[PDB]
Nucleic acid binder design. Structure first.
Ligand code: ADP
Ligand code: BEF
Lengths: 104, 95, 508, 98, 80, 95, 102, 90, 98
DNA sequence: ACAGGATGTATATATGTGACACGTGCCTGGAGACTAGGGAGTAATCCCCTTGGCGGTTAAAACGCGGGGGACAGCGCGTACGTGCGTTTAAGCGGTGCTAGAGCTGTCTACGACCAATTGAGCGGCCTCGGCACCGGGATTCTCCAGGAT
DNA sequence: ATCCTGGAGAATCCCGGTGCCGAGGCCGCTCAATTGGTCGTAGACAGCTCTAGCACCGCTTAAACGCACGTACGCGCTGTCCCCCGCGTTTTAACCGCCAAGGGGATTACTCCCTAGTCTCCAGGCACGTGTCACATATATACATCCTGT
């Protein structure tokens, strides 16, 4: 009898509803707005976690570390555009060297 | 006695186990994921509020959230998020 | 006859080499009386009647007695050349200069021919609309104007037009609005003409609106009587019997299956998938082959056989052309868009038929040269392409014997002035008007709108129309012995020049 | 002895510091600088250790980005060594006025 | 006083190596110190304003996160 | 029948005549000034709302607006604006 | 008496109060917040208009034009920093050419 | 009587930004000498910027269920991308 | 005749276009380009004249800023003539990815 | 060009250990049901505003040519940067002790939303005249020149 | 090889008349600002606390600092030659002028169904204690990589 189970979404619908009501972004909240929000957030989290898991499996690490998150974010172009200005703590930078700097 | 902060750690872990059963996540990565999700939620809520105030509409429906997603998320991310949100809204309003 | 001649001599002394007709003498006398009483009038006549002749006689008379003041002629570009030709032919010892060309050319012509002060040899300037509009504030404001004329005064339709402002900046004592069809599309646009010709008689638009079923007849008779002393009018059929009358035949053609599937692709929005909406359906009505070619991107013209047998009334068009070629008579073709003219010119050059086209891209010298070679007897040219906006105003193509309108403008007065370009003074053979219009399309709506607009100008069977015209009906329509034949026919309808329209309910 | 060229050691150092992903600035001098800059604005201000760590992380990321843009500027000028004019040009293009 | 000199030459060298700089000039260190001082001044001013708004005497990590977000650089992991 | 948009044109003209009696202002400059004032007002209101939501305070007082001014306006502009606002608030609460 | 005259401000206090209440940036609005907002907006407008009038008097023009506004905004470092990303329509850029170019 | 082919296919709308226009823009910017490919790269960058702004404005219009792109939508789209326009803004 | 050097005419043109403060791009080609780019996203979209004017103003301002940064890049490289690499470097430093 | 040695780096294995994940009490937030009202969905009008094209003209755009000033390739240098080593000094980790300050809980208390009437401020419209735009012209300045002195 | 001075020409600035359109002053009014009362809830404030920030002393060893160098790189001058720029010509497209049509923005009457607000309840989620397994560290070890002489 839960909205998250009815909508087939893992993220909580009631918590997002209460957050939107507390933030007072609108005087009246729509019925389908929290479900849409939960779906979008779940898809984004799933994409990021899948990319981070692929990066961690490529590095032969069982647990995802912030380094894997930053690598997956910088390697991905759409997530890189969505998350350009953000900096990840203990993530470093994407390893890349210019061709002019490398001796040929 | 103490405030119980509300985080998406359990849901992030569930989504990870759904997409990657064997791969785990540490505490720092969990906190980073929670911060990223909270930032995206705050950004989309602010964009939906701005859209509602621009059109002089006190209510925020799925249309406002879809427009905010199309505005914030770029390209394929926005398209897939809109598809997923429409599917979820249809499954919610049908059942 | 002799009294008209002697009156023309005693009124207009310099007018020699030509004789004014009885109606022309009455019109020029009316203009002299208007000048005497100081009331500016709107001289109006049918397109076939000679409007330039009465005005040129009036100007020659004004040059004769009293003083000789600066005279300004504002008219379209394609008619100022004919105006200068007629002022050189019908009025010797009278100077006139064409004020048109580049900035430096116009400036040097001004500084050479006309001085800063008044002069006895001051030539009557004949300029265009755009030239005068651009040079009023710069040059024309310095020189006074005792008498100005504006040929084709339908350009003065809009009351907020910039030409009105540029003319108001100019100072002129008397005016003369020359318009073949003084009344136009909706209502009260003539008030702008009335306000320009008579500022005090019609000061505001609300007054004319207040002027405006028995009371409808009462007010239309009242406005007809009010417009009587200022506006003169004569028709081609009532004053003179020397010119053969005209016959208007709306030749309906069924929309071909290619155009049928085009139209269904338009109404379900699947044309672009196969390979506003009003302009698209109109382009589908006339030569949609060029529409699909320009949306495809091909640089080469489609096959000429495919062009003629694929879409449009082009088949009925070719039937009419071969019938007229067997008839041995020149033809005039008017089109609304230059693309239709380009397609027709391409087809005619593919077939080898001699054609001359007059559009806005054609310069004044080429326009005059083409008019001259088409008005010539040795020239084997029979097909002459014209545009309804430029080539359909003020030109005298009398050598032609019939006109055919592939398209019809939303304003019926434009199509009227275009079809009456051939039927002028000196037309010996009877003229025929074949108005092409695809059947069961929106061109029928355009014609209905034009006729509802013609209703107010006059106040001052559908299944038989649906079919395609047969060869026997074409032959029944080809004969010219009736002008010197039912009113309705299969695929063709005869327009009543008096009254009537497609929708008689709106016409009444 | 074995004396390497100035290029291979620089490349090894670049690779090591790109793969390390740790804090390159010492914590105590950075904390001293942060406390001095804070006292410059308002006196008697205490600092949380996590706040100082976040400040250090943000400063390191910003300096790494600035060095990225400065190296781009230097390579554009056909010079391997970065110069103060490169940093000035990067700051001017990024819109970070002095 | 000399706390700006606390950021030593090896530290700036390591930062440039992580950036990808191969050769560093001697005058780069002072310019980098000045730029870092300007950036820290801006961020610390914003954080101190945020702290004074809440009538607190201790700068919180959330205040620094908000100050960095105001400048366009969002930091993840240290928030909260 | 028609919406009467609310602009600060009269107040901008009054301030201009106060600071410069002889100098006038055109319509384009007036519209640009109105747009600038509206943008500053919207920015400061959003910053005050964010500050109120950060401190879990439903009410926005002069303190929130002063903090938003100190955050948005740089340096001497912020100082002079804070001084003017404090003087105005004191004159309002005293009379 | 009006709130603007009561607070000694030329900008409308009631209109700003209505705007802040309609925007719903907060549930409740203090009494001094609209007065403070009006004072800040009035000071900013006065500064910008003074700079624009100075720029107009420099060009011997009595009317303030968008060009004068843009020149006054870009010349001042404070207003230039506040309106850095602002692009004023119908206004060019600062007249300046690099010394290497000359 | 020249041989005719459908003629004067319009030069691309990206080519509508002509070389003298880009030259005048560079002069206003303060450029003295301009290379050859500078015009083409300027056309490309302008196309990218217009694509972004027009996408944002079209999204704003679709949110309002309107078929016409008004000036306020363009102003909001520009404000989203950082560049604020005060003149045409309402 | 009088043939000026390529420098003085360029300086006069720069001064004239910095003092003119008008629209340098023609309205009709820019409107055609805007309509084409809009139809590329969604078809049957009408445009307001003021919206097209605002788009043109914003595009002109952005291109002027890009030319500012490109001239800065070129002067940094000790070259008077701007080159595509200068525009690419300016776009990369400004953070405007392709 | 190829063989070989010193250096750094990739790789398999043993044993911590401290951080990740799982079982549990419970409590505050999520969920079910009824209700009244204001925000939202919707049919019909219309009249301001957008679209498409013609006529033309004229200033802007475009093709072609000469040369000269700038981008670029190559070389000598000498100076500033990098690398390795003895040394030292300040970062970091451990351990304790103190207290200013963050946070929650109870109690009012002065301050802000709501609603009824209203009456003066600002937005809507038509002069209306003066600051501003375009123009012919004499005067001044900038610059291109082939000369003139040494 | 400069190095000052000379004159014609294109460009630029100051001054005079003007008219014209956009800025500026007036007025009936109407919808929003203001005043009087009330309330219950957000907020200011006194007090216990505990926990996290600040200061110091001792060992240490990794990191920072100064110096000798020699070698690779930033930098100035030179020859060029090819690409951008200045100008007569033309041609071609911007635009302002004009016109009918009609898709589309805004409003108002209505209603109705979606949602705010409240009492009750109980299950999902968070705080705390905990054992183990993934990952960090040390050591041996085979192997890839760099600098020099034959
Ligand atoms: N009195 C006349 N004698 C001979 N021809 C005449 C006469 N009057 C008019 N025309 C002919 O009429 C034409 C000039 O008048 P027209 O062009 O019809 O005036 P508009 O075009 O303004 O109606 C010429 O062809 C001319 O030969
Ligand atoms: F007056 Be025009 F010749 F018809």
């Amino acid at each position: 009898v839960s909205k998250s189970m009815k909508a087939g979404l893992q993220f909580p619908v009631g918590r997002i509803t209460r957050f939107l009501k507390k933030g007072r972004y609108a005087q009246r909240l729509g019925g389908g707005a929290p479900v849409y929000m939960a779906a979008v957030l779940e898809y984004l989290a799933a994409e990021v976690l899948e990319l981070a898991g692929n990066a961690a499996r490529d590095n032969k690490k069982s647990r995802i570390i912030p380094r894997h998150l930053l690598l997956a974010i910088r390697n991905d172009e759409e997530l890189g555009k969505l998350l350009s200005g953000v900096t990840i703590a203990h993530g470093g930078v994407l390893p890349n060297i210019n061709s002019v700097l490398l001796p040929k | 006695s103490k405030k119980n902060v509300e985080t998406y750690k359990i849901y992030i872990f569930k989504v990870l186990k759904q997409v990657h059963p064997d791969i785990g996540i540490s505490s720092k990565a969990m906190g980073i994921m929670n911060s990223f999700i909270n930032d995206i939620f705050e950004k989309l809520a602010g964009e939906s509020s701005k859209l509602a105030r621009y059109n002089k509409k006190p209510t925020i429906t799925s249309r406002e959230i879809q427009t905010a997603v199309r505005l914030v998320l770029p390209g394929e991310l926005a398209k897939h998020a809109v598809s997923e949100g429409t599917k979820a809204v249809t499954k919610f309003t049908s059942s | 006859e002799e009294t008209v001649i002697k009156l023309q001599n005693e009124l207009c002394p310099l007018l020699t080499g030509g004789q004014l007709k009885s109606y022309q003498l009455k019109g020029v006398k009316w203009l002299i009386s208007l000048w005497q009483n100081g009331l500016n009038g709107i001289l109006a006549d049918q397109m076939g009647l000679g409007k330039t002749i009465q005005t040129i006689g009036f100007l020659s008379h004004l040059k004769g007695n009293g003083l000789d003041g600066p005279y300004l002629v504002i008219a379209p570009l394609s008619t100022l050349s004919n105006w200068f030709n007629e002022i050189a032919r019908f009025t010797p010892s009278i100077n006139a200069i064409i004020y048109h060309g580049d900035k430096n050319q116009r400036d040097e012509l001004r500084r050479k021919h006309m001085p800063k002060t008044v002069g006895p040899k001051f030539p009557i300037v004949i300029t265009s609309y755009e030239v005068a509009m651009n040079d009023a504030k710069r040059i024309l404001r310095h020189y006074p104007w005792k008498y100005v004329v504006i040929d084709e005064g339908h350009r003065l339709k809009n009351h907020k037009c910039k030409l009105l402002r540029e003319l108001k900046h100019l100072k002129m004592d008397n005016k003369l609005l020359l318009t073949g069809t003084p009344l136009q599309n909706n209502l009260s646009e003539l008030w702008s003409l009335l306000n320009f010709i008579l500022p005090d008689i019609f000061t505001s638009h609300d007054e004319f609106e207040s002027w405006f079923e028995k009371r409808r007849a009462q007010v239309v008779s009242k406005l007809h009587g009010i417009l009587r002393p200022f506006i003169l009018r004569r028709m081609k059929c009532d004053v003179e019997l020397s010119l053969p009358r005209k016959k208007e035949i709306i030749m309906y053609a069924t929309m071909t299956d290619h155009q049928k599937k085009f139209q269904e692709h338009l109404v379900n929005n699947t044309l672009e998938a196969h390979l506003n909406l009003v302009i698209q359906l109109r382009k589908n009505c006339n030569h949609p082959d060029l529409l699909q070619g320009q949306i495809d991107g091909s640089y080469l013209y489609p096959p000429v056989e495919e062009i003629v047998g694929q879409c449009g009334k082009f088949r009925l068009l070719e039937r009419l052309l071969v019938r007229l070629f067997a008839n041995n008579h020149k033809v005039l073709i008017f089109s609304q868009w230059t693309k239709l003219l380009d397609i027709m010119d391409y087809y005619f050059s593919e077939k080898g038929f001699e054609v001359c086209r007059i559009d806005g891209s054609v310069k004044l010298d080429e326009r005059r040269r083409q008019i001259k070679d088409f008005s010539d007897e040795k020239s084997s040219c029979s097909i002459f392409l014209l545009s309804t906006r430029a080539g359909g105003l003020g030109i005298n193509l009398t050598a032609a014997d019939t006109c055919i309108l592939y398209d019809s403008d939303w304003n019926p007065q434009m199509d009227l002035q275009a079809m009456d370009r051939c039927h002028r003074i000196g037309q010996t053979k009877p003229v025929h008007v074949y108005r092409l219009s695809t059947a069961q399309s929106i061109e029928t709506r355009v014609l209905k709108r034009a006729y509802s607009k013609l209703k107010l100008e006059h106040v001052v069977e559908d299944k038989l129309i649906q079919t395609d015209i047969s060869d026997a009906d074409l032959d029944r329509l080809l004969d010219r012995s009736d002008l010197t034949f039912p009113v309705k026919g299969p695929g063709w309808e005869v327009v009543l020049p008096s009254s009537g329209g497609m929708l008689s309910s709106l016409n009444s | 002895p074995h004396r390497f060229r100035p290029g291979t050691v620089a490349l090894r150092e670049i690779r090591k510091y790109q793969k390390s992903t740790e804090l390159l600035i010492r914590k105590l001098p950075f904390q001293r600088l942060v406390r001095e800059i804070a006292q410059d604005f308002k006196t008697d201000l205490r600092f949380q250790s996590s706040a100082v760590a976040a400040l250090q992380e943000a400063a390191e990321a910003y300096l790494v980005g600035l060095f990225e843009d400065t190296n781009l500027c230097a390579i554009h000028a056909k010079r391997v060594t970065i110069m103060p004019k490169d940093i000035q040009l990067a700051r001017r293009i990024r819109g970070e006025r002095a | 006083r000399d706390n700006i000199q606390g950021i030593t030459k090896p530290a700036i060298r390591r930062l440039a190596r992580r950036g990808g700089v191969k050769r560093i000039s001697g005058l780069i260190y002072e310019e980098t110190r000045g730029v870092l001082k300007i950036f820290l001044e801006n961020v610390i001013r914003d954080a101190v304003t945020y702290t004074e708004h809440a009538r607190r005497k201790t700068v919180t990590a959330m205040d620094v996160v908000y100050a960095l977000k105001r400048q366009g650089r969002t930091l993840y992991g240290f928030g909260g």
